């Protein structure tokens, strides 16, 4: 069981973890410390209704929200791309397949990292300075009230797997090396890498999660839920076009949504 081949998989897990720490300053451990109220450095303010929203103040509306959250996500996309450079074999793939892998993968990784910011009560905002409640978000007028609730539904179940940053480093690498993306030119060298990452993930979860039989399968099922969240955005855009009701939104709420995804 401990042999040259398993040692190589442990080495790959550590290489990915080290690169993950270098690439992503916003770790899961950091997010959870704030959520469970462990960090006494300027604790986050809770925004749970319109009155607290106003006390928290420190070209359709929805389209502007999406333009703004995509702009605020540029740094995350850059961090993800830097991380992908550290995955052995990735930079040797055809450049167009590297771009294709990242253009679909970044959205799923952003949602994975957004889950770290979420619990059943709400989500961290304003660089950890604020906490926006789930039920306040859900209470807002259509179509805005429906934006975030399926991501909370995903995050609560995802967080119950109790993955740590060591796990997440390999899981995110597996997401990037998805051989089933549309428009990929050479699928086999991608699959070759992903199969090695999958072996490394399998071993990592056995060593790190004695409590969870079928955790490997359950985590692979989550990749299915991530893709569905992304494709639900197309439907959300259609709901916005169709919407024949007032879609005005408080500017502070617009600002909060631009911090989400």
């Amino acid at each position: 069981q401990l042999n040259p081949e398993s040692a190589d998989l442990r080495a790959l897990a550590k290489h990915l973890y080290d690169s993950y720490i270098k690439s992503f300053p916003l770790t899961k451990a950091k997010a959870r410390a704030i959520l469970t109220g462990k960090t006494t450095d300027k604790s986050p303010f809770v925004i749970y209704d319109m009155n607290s929203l106003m006390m928290g103040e420190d070209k359709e509306v929805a389209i502007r929200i999406f333009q703004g959250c995509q702009f605020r996500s540029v740094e995350a996309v850059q961090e993800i791309t830097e991380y992908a450079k550290s995955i052995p074999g990735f930079v040797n793939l055809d450049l167009n397949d590297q771009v294709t892998l990242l253009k679909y993968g970044v959205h799923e990784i952003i949602y994975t990292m957004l889950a770290s910011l979420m619990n059943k009560d709400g989500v961290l905002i304003s660089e950890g300075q604020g906490f926006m409640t789930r039920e306040f978000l859900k209470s807002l007028r259509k179509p805005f009230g429906d934006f975030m609730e399926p991501k909370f539904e995903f995050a609560v179940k995802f967080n119950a797997l109790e993955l740590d940053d060591s796990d997440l480093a390999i899981f995110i690498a597996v997401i990037i090396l998805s051989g089933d993306r549309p428009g990929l030119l050479n699928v086999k060298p991608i699959e070759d890498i992903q199969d090695n990452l999958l072996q490394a993930l399998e071993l990592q979860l056995k060593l790190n999660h004695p409590e969870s039989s079928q955790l490997f399968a359950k985590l692979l099922q989550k990749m299915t839920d991530l893709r569905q969240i992304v494709t639900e955005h197309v439907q959300l855009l259609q709901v916005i076009k169709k919407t024949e009701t007032d879609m005005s939104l408080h500017p502070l709420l617009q600002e909060i949504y631009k911090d989400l995804y």
Binding site: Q70, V74, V77, T81, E82, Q98, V99, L102, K103
Partner: peptide, 13 residues
């Protein structure tokens, strides 16, 4: 998104 592909292509440089 062509803009997103642009950001990725430059970060890959």
């Amino acid at each position: 998104n062509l803009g997103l592909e642009d950001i990725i292509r430059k970060a890959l440089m």
